[PDB]
């Protein structure tokens, strides 16, 4: 299943305050209007690719979605990031886990015998090497996950919503929740749910963005410069307003089709 991403997944690229300024930057962003893939709790958390990075979201109120899993092979033969968001806190672990058939978490029975998750149920882990650890529908919970030079980052934005069906049109921006110099190689991922919900995914790309920082230091508008010839013009003029005119953005250059290699035949 798919739907339109609109503006979603804009985040503060660096920890600098700026205001009333149209700062231009090259980084991994979710491209404007790109399709997200969409998923459901009705019998759906296979190993996705991660590509350059993931935008994620869920529309929630049940809070059955409670984490994420990442790596190359996710099977203890490498270190695997686990993120949890249980009760009140983001909680993070990076052990050599050995996950069950599904990221189904395990769940909270009647309290009379004490009630807790069992670490999935089948096996869940088969080695330690836990090189890091940490502790901190009505709502949409946006996130971004990227790794560059071993710095894995989490960003987020929590907001109320009315559109049950899709990612809402409009705008909002994500501050970093966490930055982690943990150095793990990530090319695939999964999401945790409890076992008794819907989530979204799209992939980041290296893009130029023009970012309108407002008077309160806050990013409140963005241009994805590569989206279309108009957005190339907005970034060419460093401006969200373009007047009636004609503007050179670039040079259209026929890409090389193949590599034709010749040497003396000796």
């Amino acid at each position, epitope marked *: 299943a798919y739907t339109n991403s609109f503006t979603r997944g804009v985040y503060y690229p660096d920890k600098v305050f700026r205001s009333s300024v149209l700062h231009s930057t090259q980084d991994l962003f979710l491209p404007f209007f790109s399709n997200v893939t969409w998923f459901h709790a009705i019998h759906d958390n296979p190993v996705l690719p991660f590509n350059d990075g993931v935008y994620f979201a869920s529309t929630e109120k049940s809070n059955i979605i409670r984490g994420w899993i990442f790596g190359t092979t996710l099977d203890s033969k490498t270190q695997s990031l686990l993120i949890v968001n249980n009760a009140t806190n983001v909680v993070i672990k990076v052990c050599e886990f050995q996950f069950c058939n599904d990221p189904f978490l395990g769940v909270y029975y*009647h309290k*009379n015998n004490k009630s807790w998750m069992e670490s999935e149920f089948r096996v869940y882990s088969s080695a330690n090497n836990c090189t890091f650890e940490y502790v901190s529908f009505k709502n949409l919970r946006e996130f971004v996950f990227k790794n560059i030079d071993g710095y894995f980052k989490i960003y987020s934005k929590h907001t109320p919503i009315n559109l049950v069906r899709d990612l809402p049109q409009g705008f909002s921006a994500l501050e970093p929740l966490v930055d982690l110099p943990i150095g793990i190689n990530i090319t695939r991922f999964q999401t945790l749910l409890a076992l*008794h919900a819907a989530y979204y995914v799209g992939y980041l790309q290296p893009r130029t963005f023009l970012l309108k920082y407002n008077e309160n230091g806050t990013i409140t508008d963005a241009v994805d410069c590569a989206l279309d010839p108009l957005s190339e013009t907005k970034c060419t003029l460093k401006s969200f307003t373009v007047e009636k005119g004609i503007y050179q953005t670039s040079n259209f250059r026929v890409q090389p089709t193949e590599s034709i290699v010749r040497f003396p035949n000796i």
Partner: antibody, heavy 122, light 112 residues
């Protein structure tokens, strides 16, 4: 779904003591309202104890209380009925049961574990 | 507490429908009857049968149902043959959380 499994069949003397385990399988023990019940052989049943979901109390039937006891182990997922100081009417089947079951997801119905027939004689 | 008792057999010829009854001191304490039924076939273990005098467990072939109220409870047996030939014990399950007790049994059989 959960399965309940009795300790086969058993024989102990009058004035001696018997412990019957019940294994539970598919899923773990503490989540389950474990209960225990007598049967006079091929005749009427009678209660002797069980975990209420109120307070987790392993309460007992007054006709057998203190002399009958219950205990548990998570390491094997075994419940236990232990009946001390055996008497003429203790040539019973002892049934394991629980109003719970679960499958990670929560549930509440009362399956039974077939129960150990026991002989008591001199 | 919710003590209870029942008739010996309630038997009938093959293909009959018959009514099990249970009678006692009170309802299951705290509301309508939590009384539940357990069906033991000749020489074999009990199955769970109708519970709270209304709720039907898995695998029941529709030929069984609950009845009556207060200090009494009842269960229907229909089309009776082998394996329907069984002892239908009543027992009380008040809130799942107030002390349980068990009936004298009612052993139906294909009437010889």
């Amino acid at each position: 779904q959960v399965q309940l499994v009795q300790s086969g069949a058993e024989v102990k003397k009058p004035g001696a003591s018997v412990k019957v385990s019940c294994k539970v399988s598919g899923y773990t023990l503490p989540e389950l309202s474990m209960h225990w019940v007598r049967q006079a052989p091929g005749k009427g049943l009678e209660w002797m104890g069980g975990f209420h979901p109120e307070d987790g109390e392993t309460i007992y039937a007054q006709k057998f209380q203190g002399r009958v006891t219950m205990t548990e182990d998570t390491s094997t997922d075994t419940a236990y009925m232990e009946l001390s100081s055996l008497r003429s009417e203790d040539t019973a089947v002892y049934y394991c049961a629980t109003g719970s079951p679960f499958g990670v997801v929560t549930d509440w119905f009362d399956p039974w574990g077939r129960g150990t027939l026991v002989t008591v004689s001199s | 507490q919710s003590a209870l008792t029942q008739p010996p057999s309630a038997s009938g010829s093959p293909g009959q429908s018959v009514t099990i009854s249970c009678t006692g001191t009170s309802s299951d304490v705290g509301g309508y009857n939590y009384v539940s039924w357990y069906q033991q076939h000749p020489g074999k273990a009990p199955k769970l049968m109708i519970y709270e005098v209304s709720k039907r467990p898995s695998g029941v072939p529709d030929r069984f149902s609950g009845s009556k109220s207060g200090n009494t409870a009842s269960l229907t047996v229909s089309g009776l043959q082998a394996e329907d030939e069984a002892d239908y014990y009543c027992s009380s399950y008040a809130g799942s959380n107030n002390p349980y007790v068990f009936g004298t049994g009612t052993k139906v059989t294909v009437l010889g």
